Design a protein around this ligand. Structure first.
Ligand SMILES: Nc1ncnc2c1ncn2[C@@H]1O[C@H](COP(=O)(O)OP(=O)(O)CP(=O)(O)O)[C@@H](O)[C@H]1O
Ligand SMILES: Nc1ncnc2c1ncn2[C@@H]1O[C@H](COP(=O)(O)OP(=O)(O)CP(=O)(O)O)[C@@H](O)[C@H]1O
Ligand code: NA
Ligand code: NA
Lengths: 375, 375
């Protein structure tokens, strides 16, 4: 019986849970109000504030941090790496604290687990960071030398549902081909070729179909124009990619249930914009089908939007069932996903990756690719 | 027997030809050197220069402009309109001369035909302008209210090959479903649903797969960043979408035959970038397949790149034949295409559209769509 602690720091919340083997024994979401949050200049300044909530969470359990077998955290903005469960080390910490790859609340998670680790000797891990990158070189070329397509998406949910589909039919994730569509506030559509995400859109940076809250890919010219059109507000213009865009920008809401209600009342602009979102998701799924050369076992719809079975799901299904049957796996459980990955490691069913080495192996391969600087 | 004159003004050249029914009797390309061309401030200033070449072309024929039955020109940057053959009228001229929709050498063609028309009484037409737009509303939504997907591509070649495929099997263009891929210096991939191009990428404005000379769609964030990174050269940064991008930017050449030669010599970066271009064309064809809900009769590869049957064509075919069989229709004949469209009209096999009315009908429909300004 292994007792595990999962750490999941988000932009506006902090989720923690305790697992005893595969059974969850405690979980609590600690939301943070804009007020309470704006009290910090840089994101790193929240470090002690959030650690305090975690120590407190275990504290009022009667258990001590040394009674745990592992501490597991959501990855963060680490350098590109293959999927898997990594041991938190010195290089990871240095990178996270220096925000060399950007600052994000999720970076605090690994740091927090590491300290819990230095005080108890218990192992700390991070699994499937948002920077998981397992794509093929051909997918990196963008059309212009000083631009690269990068793999930045909800890799944890992707990998997790893919393995769930396999396990459901007692097959191996490694022997299938899938098109998995994670449709939440962010939308990533990935091509899984034999356990490897060979191509996917850069969801986190706003590339792809538009979402309930993001605008997704936008017209090039019209952009470079409205770019320096005086309307320049590096911030304002920058929030139209991850904050103020998509359904919320057209209908004034990012709640699908609200939008479906309107469609049932005869709202035509609402239905036209919602239908356009499904239309885009379908197109991208088509892109990924072409990536797999048509060899697709299943198309999987997952994420919050997969719950909407009256319009969205049926619309997508009609357009893409010619590629492969459609399977719906609604939602996503980050806590359970992280704890199980740590259990597999503790049970010796999976080998822990070493971020340090693993990062070098990746950069070495990427650097050989990047050697296109030869004129 | 109808004698027709075709006018085709390009960025750096001017092509004219004379058809007597379906037989071509004279054609000549008048290239214009950067020197000879830079002699004009605005594009409109070339008007008299190019008209002089056309009058001269007919001049040394022994024929007079009044012996013709029609004058046909390549469309230009007119307001959005459905496909077809239009009669050149006052509204078209006003729009072209004022460059309200942008300046382009192709705008001079209609103007030149109109004058030839005012002097002889003979009818002047423009067919399938680059601004043909027959897409469905759902395809217009971009993800953000002040951005629209527009249909701007090589509509003449598109429409022409589509009808050729049909005629080849004695069927009607109006009763088929096709995915036509025009792969030249510009790459447009369009979904033809029963004679109507319901969706296609904005090729002319750099949206889509990268081409031998254009970069195509680029990463959003990385763009908005490099946008105002001091490197700002509204011009320089603007030519990385239609002039300096794509294969030419990576390999230093936009000649596919040159690139194929390198691949045969073992060049690996060359092969990797070329293969990435095919890879992208395939993905977009996948997008259009999803637009047609999988109901695709044929996938058609046309344009210059369709000539390359050693690598490009076979690579695309492998990835997309699961959608529908692939047909290769290399090149494109603009002269023959324009003259035939005028012959059909002169023979009464096709009705001439009226740009004036046709433009209103289009804007009325678009304006109802654009009424999403209701909060
Ligand atoms: N039962 C339900 N019916 C219809 N829509 C639902 C739903 N439950 C959730 N949604 C919708 O699905 C969307 C996504 O929820 P999800 O939990 O995946 O998003 P997220 O807020 O966590 C952001 P991201 O996906 O980028 O992490 C929501 O924005 C909501 O509009
Ligand atoms: N026989 C051949 N074999 C291989 N490639 C060829 C070819 N003939 C032409 N090409 C290539 O195909 C590409 C397109 O020629 P195409 O005539 O369609 O282009 P274009 O210069 O007219 C520009 P656009 O398509 O935007 O009008 C060229 O850029 C060239 O590299
Ligand atoms: Na978008
Ligand atoms: Na591109």
């Amino acid at each position: 019986m292994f007792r595990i602690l999962t750490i999941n720091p988000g932009s506006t919340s902090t989720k923690l849970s305790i697992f005893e083997d595969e059974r969850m024994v405690k979980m609590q979401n600690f939301s943070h109000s804009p007020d309470e949050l704006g009290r910090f200049q840089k994101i790193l300044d929240q470090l002690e504030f959030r650690e305090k909530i975690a120590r407190q969470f275990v504290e009022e359990t009667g258990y001590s941090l040394s009674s745990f077998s592992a501490f597991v955290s959501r990855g963060g903005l680490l350098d590109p790496i293959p999927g898997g469960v990594y041991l938190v080390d010195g290089l990871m910490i240095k990178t996270l604290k220096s925000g060399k790859n950007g600052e994000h609340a999720s970076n605090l998670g690994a740091i927090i687990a590491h300290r819990f680790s230095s005080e108890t000797g218990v192992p700390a891990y991070v699994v499937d960071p948002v920077v998981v990158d397992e794509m093929e070189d051909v997918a990196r070329v963008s059309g212009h030398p000083n631009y690269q397509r990068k793999s930045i998406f909800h890799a944890l949910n992707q990998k997790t549902v893919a393995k769930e589909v396999a396990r459901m039919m007692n097959k191996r994730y490694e022997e299938m081909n899938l098109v998995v569509a994670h449709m939440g506030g962010g939308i990533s559509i990935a091509a899984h070729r034999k356990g490897r995400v060979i191509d996917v859109n850069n969801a986190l940076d706003g590339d792809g179909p538009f979402t309930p809250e993001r605008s997704g890919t936008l017209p090039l010219t019209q952009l470079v124009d409205l770019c320096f059109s005086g309307k320049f507000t590096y911030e304002e213009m920058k929030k139209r990619i991850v904050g103020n865009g998509g359904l919320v920008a057209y209908l004034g809401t990012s709640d699908a249930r609200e939008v479906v209600r309107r469609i049932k009342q005869g709202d035509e602009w609402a239905k036209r914009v919602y239908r356009a979102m499904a239309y885009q998701i379908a197109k991208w799924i088509g892109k990924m089908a072409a990536v797999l050369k048509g060899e697709v076992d299943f198309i999987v719809l997952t994420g919050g939007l997969a719950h909407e079975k009256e319009f969205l799901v049926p619309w997508i299904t009609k357009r893409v069932s010619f590629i492969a049957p459609v399977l719906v796996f609604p939602g996503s459980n980050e806590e359970k996903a992280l704890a199980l990955s740590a259990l597999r490691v503790l049970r010796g069913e999976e080998k822990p990756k070493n971020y340090s080495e693993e990062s070098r192996r990746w950069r070495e391969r990427y650097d050989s690719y990047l050697d296109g600087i030869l004129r």
